[PDB]
Structures are given as structure tokens and as C-alpha cells.
Design a protein around this ligand. Structure first.
Ligand SMILES: CN(C)[C@@H]1C(O)=C(C(N)=O)C(=O)[C@@]2(O)C(=O)C[C@@H]([C@]3(C)OC(=O)c4c(O)ccc(Cl)c43)C[C@@H]12
Ligand SMILES: CN(C)[C@@H]1C(O)=C(C(N)=O)C(=O)[C@@]2(O)C(O)=C3C(=O)c4c(O)ccc(Cl)c4[C@@](C)(O)[C@H]3C[C@@H]12
Ligand SMILES: [Mg+2]
Lengths: 207, 196
């Protein structure tokens, strides 16, 4: 194969969907590309280096609501931004676990800076703006991880005997499974956003 | 060693703190207990079975705000419940990654049912009550995961920002975020059929 950055990464992403993060090794990537290991080592030093790069690339390719639109309200930006972030994490098996074990890349700095400036120029102290942005991040991350890791454990685990399930719980699990968690996610998201709105509005009032 | 359930699990928890979740294997647990692998297999079939049990045990031992107090408001129960959940996840290395993607165990049923009933008795449709409880769960999980991970130039606002989240473990960002969630649910509940 061709062995530039882009090709190595295209191959790595496909491999990730076949094996998931734990079955992703340098040996298997060498095979898939049709090359010996020392050849690969020249381009890719080890597993950590590869993951760091996949993290960055998943967002660069698929997280396209990174910045506010012109005139857009902070509420709406938080909404769209979070939607875009879940979509991207979901696009690859173990996407979220790949992201988690990484920190922001040079390329991502000034995208995040712009996000922080945008909140402050809308009335948030730098602190409160960061808290808001983190909260949305964490909530999203956790919601996707519980979806993805729950479906990764359906392999080695039994079913729950609906027999001894109590009634509310039984109805509750049927509801989680009716979709991917999108509804619970969007509903939760609105509650977060309004909660930040109440905090901002209050200023120095007791609220 | 003794090889009952409790002993295997005590050992598994210690091992978890030494290796973290990726270095937790059946081979290494056998060694730690001073036994051959087939001996272990009789008690523990594989890694998944072990993790399912650790998940359940971490909470059974350390998650002690799992039911409402008498007279307690739903707001307050969500608050205390989430604090207690975070504390328990934090007590062991990779505690949160252990919990990921588990569902309630037979011996948790009573407890989670009671939590759902409590919300409905407080005015939530079963659906809206579940969404609230999940949102708290997911948010807490994500916040603990980013803490636990990230104990493994640069533009101005961001650099001021990162200094601020490193000033503690993330507890402040968590508790602040938590209050925003709770109030947000309050606004939704109290609106009823109003447009809000
Ligand atoms: C989901 N969005 C809110 C953000 C996002 O749009 C991006 C992005 N690259 O466009 C992030 O990287 C984010 O998704 C993201 O994951 C990071 C996150 C944040 C606040 O920025 C950080 O610099 C940073 C950090 O260094 C440590 C923890 C956290 Cl939570 C953060 C900002 C995230
Ligand atoms: C963190 N806290 C809100 C909850 C908690 O107190 C639990 C507990 N055992 O005491 C949980 O198991 C929970 O932490 C917890 O783990 C829950 C959860 O896992 C979950 C899943 O995955 C699927 C369906 C349901 Cl109904 C649940 C559910 C709602 O029971 C939650 C409850 C929470
Ligand atoms: Mg759970």
C-alpha cells in the first residue's frame, strides 16, 4: 500500500471497526497494509502514538459543529456542539474510548479558545463558561460510553431474566432500548442548558 | 488462600489498584492468590464475569446514599445520590471504567426500583424520571472518567482555564454542573403543560 499519514490512518480506522480498540495492534495493522513490521515502525512508533492520532482524526473528519454560527445564541451553540460531538464519537467502534485516553492536539487549541471566548463575550465568567463547556462534554462522553460499552459486553454476558424483573425497572429498560439513548440524551441536554441559563441570569441574586 | 467469593473479590480489588483494568488478567489474579489457573477457573470463568461482580461490589461496599431519606426532596436525593456514586467510583483505580456498560444486578433490583418509584411519586412520568436519573448517571460517569484518565506554547484563555481545572480534582466543576442539571429538571417538571 501507500504509506503516508492519511493511508495509515484510513487503514487504522477500518481495523478499529473490525477489532475494536483491544484487538487493534501494530502487528494486525502491518498485515492489513501488506507490510512487515519494521517497515511499519518507521511510520508509526507504537500503539499510543496511533491512538493519539486517531482521536484527533475522528473529530477532524466528523465533528463539524466546532464553532458558533454567526449571530448564534450560546444556548444553540451548546446544543449543536454536543450533538456533533456524540455523532462523531459514535461513528466508530470504541470511538469514545479512543478519545478518552487522549488530550487536545495543537490543531484543537485555537478551536477551543474560540469556544471559550464566545462564552465570555456572552456574559460568562471564564470559569463559569468553562464549567458549562466541560459539563456538556462530560455528559455527552458518559452517555456515549455507556451505549458503546454496553453493546461491547452483549458478547460475553447473559440476558436478564424478565421473570424476576420488578415492574418499573422492566418498563424502564424497555425504554432505554427503544433507541440508542438519543432521546434520553437530548432531553438531558436541554435540562443542562436551561440550568446554565438560570445561573447566568441570576448574577449576584440568590437563586 | 481462601477461595470463596468474598476472598476472590478482595484480591481482585487490590490487584485492580496495582495494575488498573488493562493489567487485570486471570493469570495475574491466580498468581496473587497463589494458585494455578485451572483452580481459579472453577471459581471464576473469565474476565467479564469478574468485572461484572466488581462493579456490583464497589457500589455495595461504598455507595451508601442509594435511597432517599425520610421526607427528603427529589432535588436533594439526586444531589446526595450523585455525590455518593462519585465517591465510590473514585475509590479504586479505573473504578469508572469498571462500571461502564453494566446494568443492574439481581441484588440491586429492589434499590433501583425504589429510586424510580420515588421520582414518580414526586410528579415525574416514569419516562421523565428515568431521563433525569440517567442524565445524572452519565454526567457523573464522564466527570469521574476524565479525572481518572488525566492522572495518566498555548493560547491565553485556555491556559487560564486549564490552570483552573487543575486547582482541584474536578470536584468544583462537577458540583457546579450537578446543580445546573438539577435546576434544569426542576424547570421542566414545574412547567407541566406550559410552554417553557
Ligand atoms: C464537546 N465540546 C464542548 C468540545 C469540543 O467542541 C471540542 C472540539 N475539539 O471541538 C473538544 O475537543 C472537546 O470535545 C473536548 O473534548 C475537550 C473539551 C475541553 C473543555 O476543552 C479542553 O481543552 C479540555 C481539556 O483539556 C480537558 C477536559 C475538557 Cl472537558 C476540555 C472541549 C470539547
Ligand atoms: C447513580 N445513581 C443515579 C444510581 C444508583 O444509585 C445506582 C444504585 N445501584 O444505587 C445505580 O446502579 C445507578 O448508578 C446506575 O448504575 C444505573 C444504571 O446503571 C442504569 C442502567 O444502566 C440501565 C437502567 C437503569 Cl433503570 C439504570 C439505573 C437507573 O438503575 C441507574 C441508577 C444509578
Ligand atoms: Mg450503571
Amino acid at each position: 500500500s501507500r504509506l503516508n499519514r492519511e493511508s495509515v490512518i484510513d487503514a487504522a480506522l477500518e481495523l478499529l471497526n473490525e477489532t475494536g480498540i483491544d484487538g487493534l495492534t501494530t502487528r494486525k495493522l502491518a498485515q492489513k497494509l501488506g507490510i512487515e513490521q519494521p517497515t511499519l515502525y518507521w511510520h508509526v512508533k507504537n500503539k499510543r502514538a496511533l491512538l493519539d492520532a486517531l482521536a484527533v482524526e475522528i473529530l477532524a473528519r466528523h465533528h463539524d459543529y466546532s464553532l458558533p454560527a454567526a449571530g448564534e445564541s450560546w444556548q444553540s451553540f451548546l446544543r449543536n456542539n454536543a450533538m456533533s460531538f456524540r455523532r462523531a464519537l459514535l461513528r466508530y467502534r470504541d470511538g469514545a474510548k479512543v478519545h478518552l485516553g487522549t488530550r487536545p492536539d495543537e490543531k484543537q487549541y485555537d478551536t477551543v479558545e474560540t469556544q471559550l471566548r464566545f462564552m465570555t463575550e456572552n456574559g460568562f465568567s471564564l470559569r463559569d463558561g468553562l464549567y458549562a463547556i466541560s459539563a456538556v462534554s462530560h455528559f455527552t462522553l458518559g452517555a456515549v460510553l455507556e451505549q458503546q460499552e454496553h453493546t461491547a459486553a452483549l458478547t460475553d454476558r447473559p440476558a436478564a431474566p424478565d421473570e424476576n424483573l420488578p415492574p418499573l425497572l422492566r418498563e424502564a429498560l424497555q425504554i432505554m432500548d427503544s433507541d440508542d439513548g438519543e432521546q434520553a440524551f437530548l432531553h438531558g441536554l436541554e435540562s443542562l442548558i436551561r440550568g446554565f441559563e438560570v445561573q447566568l441570569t441570576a448574577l449576584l441574586q440568590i437563586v
